[PDB]
Design an enzyme around this catalytic site. Structure first.
Site, PDB file in Angstrom:
ATOM      1  N   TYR A 105      35.385  49.815  52.289  1.00 58.18           N
ATOM      2  CA  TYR A 105      35.186  49.447  53.695  1.00 58.18           C
ATOM      3  C   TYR A 105      36.431  49.655  54.554  1.00 58.18           C
ATOM      4  O   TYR A 105      36.322  50.071  55.707  1.00 58.18           O
ATOM      5  CB  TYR A 105      34.723  47.987  53.811  1.00 58.18           C
ATOM      6  CG  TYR A 105      33.494  47.658  52.985  1.00 58.18           C
ATOM      7  CD1 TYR A 105      33.417  46.468  52.261  1.00 58.18           C
ATOM      8  CD2 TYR A 105      32.414  48.541  52.915  1.00 58.18           C
ATOM      9  CE1 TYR A 105      32.295  46.159  51.501  1.00 58.18           C
ATOM     10  CE2 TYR A 105      31.291  48.244  52.153  1.00 58.18           C
ATOM     11  CZ  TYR A 105      31.240  47.055  51.445  1.00 58.18           C
ATOM     12  OH  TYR A 105      30.127  46.759  50.691  1.00 58.18           O
ATOM     13  N   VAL A 110      43.827  47.168  52.822  1.00 59.35           N
ATOM     14  CA  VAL A 110      44.422  45.840  52.658  1.00 59.35           C
ATOM     15  C   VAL A 110      45.931  45.937  52.892  1.00 59.35           C
ATOM     16  O   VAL A 110      46.612  46.768  52.285  1.00 59.35           O
ATOM     17  CB  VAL A 110      44.138  45.244  51.248  1.00 59.35           C
ATOM     18  CG1 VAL A 110      44.859  43.914  51.053  1.00 59.35           C
ATOM     19  CG2 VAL A 110      42.637  45.057  51.036  1.00 59.35           C
ATOM     20  N   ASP A 164      31.505  45.079  39.934  1.00 62.13           N
ATOM     21  CA  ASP A 164      32.531  46.112  39.919  1.00 62.13           C
ATOM     22  C   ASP A 164      33.817  45.654  39.266  1.00 62.13           C
ATOM     23  O   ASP A 164      34.911  45.911  39.765  1.00 62.13           O
ATOM     24  CB  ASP A 164      32.792  46.608  41.353  1.00 62.13           C
ATOM     25  CG  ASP A 164      33.428  47.995  41.394  1.00 62.13           C
ATOM     26  OD1 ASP A 164      33.310  48.752  40.404  1.00 62.13           O
ATOM     27  OD2 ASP A 164      34.038  48.325  42.439  1.00 62.13           O
ATOM     28  N   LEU A 175      48.790  47.554  50.813  1.00 64.77           N
ATOM     29  CA  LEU A 175      48.570  47.127  49.431  1.00 64.77           C
ATOM     30  C   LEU A 175      47.501  47.961  48.722  1.00 64.77           C
ATOM     31  O   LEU A 175      47.571  48.162  47.507  1.00 64.77           O
ATOM     32  CB  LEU A 175      48.202  45.643  49.391  1.00 64.77           C
ATOM     33  CG  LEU A 175      49.212  44.688  50.039  1.00 64.77           C
ATOM     34  CD1 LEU A 175      48.749  43.250  49.893  1.00 64.77           C
ATOM     35  CD2 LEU A 175      50.607  44.869  49.451  1.00 64.77           C
TER      36      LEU A 175
HETATM   37  C1  LIG Z   1      52.865  50.664  43.013  1.00 71.84           C
HETATM   38  N1  LIG Z   1      52.218  49.576  43.771  1.00 71.84           N
HETATM   39  C2  LIG Z   1      52.510  48.265  43.172  1.00 71.84           C
HETATM   40  C3  LIG Z   1      51.917  47.145  44.024  1.00 71.84           C
HETATM   41  N2  LIG Z   1      50.505  47.420  44.316  1.00 71.84           N
HETATM   42  C4  LIG Z   1      49.743  46.385  44.800  1.00 71.84           C
HETATM   43  C5  LIG Z   1      50.319  45.265  45.399  1.00 71.84           C
HETATM   44  C6  LIG Z   1      49.541  44.222  45.901  1.00 71.84           C
HETATM   45  C7  LIG Z   1      48.145  44.270  45.826  1.00 71.84           C
HETATM   46  C8  LIG Z   1      47.282  43.143  46.330  1.00 71.84           C
HETATM   47  C9  LIG Z   1      47.845  41.862  46.462  1.00 71.84           C
HETATM   48  N3  LIG Z   1      47.147  40.799  46.896  1.00 71.84           N
HETATM   49  C10 LIG Z   1      45.845  40.972  47.192  1.00 71.84           C
HETATM   50  N4  LIG Z   1      44.948  40.050  47.615  1.00 71.84           N
HETATM   51  C11 LIG Z   1      43.732  40.651  47.786  1.00 71.84           C
HETATM   52  C12 LIG Z   1      42.486  40.197  48.192  1.00 71.84           C
HETATM   53  N5  LIG Z   1      41.447  41.052  48.257  1.00 71.84           N
HETATM   54  C13 LIG Z   1      41.584  42.359  47.928  1.00 71.84           C
HETATM   55  C14 LIG Z   1      40.368  43.223  48.019  1.00 71.84           C
HETATM   56  O1  LIG Z   1      40.452  44.437  47.723  1.00 71.84           O
HETATM   57  O2  LIG Z   1      39.296  42.710  48.409  1.00 71.84           O
HETATM   58  C15 LIG Z   1      42.826  42.871  47.512  1.00 71.84           C
HETATM   59  C16 LIG Z   1      43.899  41.982  47.452  1.00 71.84           C
HETATM   60  C17 LIG Z   1      45.212  42.182  47.084  1.00 71.84           C
HETATM   61  C18 LIG Z   1      45.913  43.311  46.644  1.00 71.84           C
HETATM   62  C19 LIG Z   1      47.571  45.381  45.202  1.00 71.84           C
HETATM   63  C20 LIG Z   1      48.347  46.423  44.701  1.00 71.84           C
HETATM   64  C21 LIG Z   1      50.154  48.767  44.771  1.00 71.84           C
HETATM   65  C22 LIG Z   1      50.758  49.760  43.795  1.00 71.84           C
END
Ligand SMILES: CN1CCN(c2ccc(-c3cnc4[nH]c5cnc(C(=O)O)cc5c4c3)cc2)CC1
Length: 264
Positions: free
Chosen positions: A18, A21, A121, A13
């Site tokens: 650090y 994910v 941030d 993701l």
């Molecule tokens: C082209 N792609 C589309 C989908 N994309 C993407 C998809 C899912 C997530 C995503 C979903 N649930 C998430 N729940 C989280 C909890 N904590 C964090 C963190 O960085 O601490 C990050 C997350 C987190 C990231 C972040 C980005 C990545 C780019």
């Protein structure tokens, strides 16, 4: 219903300071969760702060479990991904969508500040969207306590992300925590309404920031933004953090309170 904590990884993701994910899918209950994997060979503090948080506009913390060198954090999976990917380069997004996300952002930040936590941030890459497009604040890796036992602590650590940081963080030895988060929210709003960041950093050495201080709103990104939200931005992106608008007053702003979007 046993075996409720057995997960299968599927997709990367993202990547933080650090670690990385990953999406993880449950066994029996079929729950999807986000798992942060950091090779410790900071996260301790990140976990501690996460344990304090419980709000509809903050990404939920489920738990943690280490295996010698590799720390796992279990967090709510936000299937809508990052706000970053809803911002169309050079365009932004529809003003009613931006307004709704900004309402939810303020709700989340008010919550954090109310419990004495500053994020430090805030940016579209750290603001996630759930299945119903509700905005959730994520990544507390730079977060810290600025109020404890009803006593405020001034910050001095330079941190965050340059295009989003407030000018006092670059100019002053110490500074109040809350106006720094307010400023970054203003940069987020600018990005949502213009699809571009206004400056590399809010320093005298940055021409785009000088232009803004000179009130050259006939230039981009400002000329793309309607007078009403632009008037709010004029109150948020104020160099003096003591003169900067506070969240209680953002909540009284004309644009903030403009009816724009129909319900679902
Ligand atoms: C082209 N792609 C589309 C989908 N994309 C993407 C998809 C899912 C997530 C995503 C979903 N649930 C998430 N729940 C989280 C909890 N904590 C964090 C963190 O960085 O601490 C990050 C997350 C987190 C990231 C972040 C980005 C990545 C780019």
């Amino acid at each position: 219903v046993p075996f409720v904590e057995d997960w299968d990884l599927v997709q990367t993701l993202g990547e933080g300071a650090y670690g990385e994910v990953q999406l993880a899918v449950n066994r029996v209950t079929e729950e999807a969760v986000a798992v942060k994997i950091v090779d410790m060979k900071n996260i301790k503090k990140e976990i501690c702060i996460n344990k304090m948080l419980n709000h509809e506009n903050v990404v939920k913390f489920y738990g943690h479990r280490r295996e010698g060198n590799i720390q796992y954090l279990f967090l709510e999976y936000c299937s809508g991904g990052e706000l970053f990917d809803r911002i169309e380069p050079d365009i932004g997004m529809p003003e009613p969508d931006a307004q709704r996300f900004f309402h939810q952002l303020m709700a989340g930040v008010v919550y954090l500040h109310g419990i004495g936590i500053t994020h430090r941030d805030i940016k579209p890459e750290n603001l996630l969207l759930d299945e119903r497009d509700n905005l959730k604040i994520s990544d507390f890796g730079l977060a810290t306590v600025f109020r404890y036992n009803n006593r405020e602590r001034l910050l001095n650590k330079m941190c965050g992300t340059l295009p989003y940081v407030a000018p006092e963080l670059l100019k002053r030895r110490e500074f109040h925590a809350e106006p720094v988060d307010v400023w970054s929210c203003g940069i987020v709003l600018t990005a949502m309404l213009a699809g571009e960041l206004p400056w590399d950093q809010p320093s005298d050495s940055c021409q785009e920031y000088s232009d803004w201080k000179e009130k050259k709103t006939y230039l981009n990104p400002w000329k793309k933004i309607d007078s009403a939200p632009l008037a709010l931005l004029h109150k948020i992106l104020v160099e003096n953090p003591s003169a900067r608008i506070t969240i209680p007053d953002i909540k009284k702003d004309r644009w903030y309170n403009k009816p724009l979007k129909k319900g679902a």
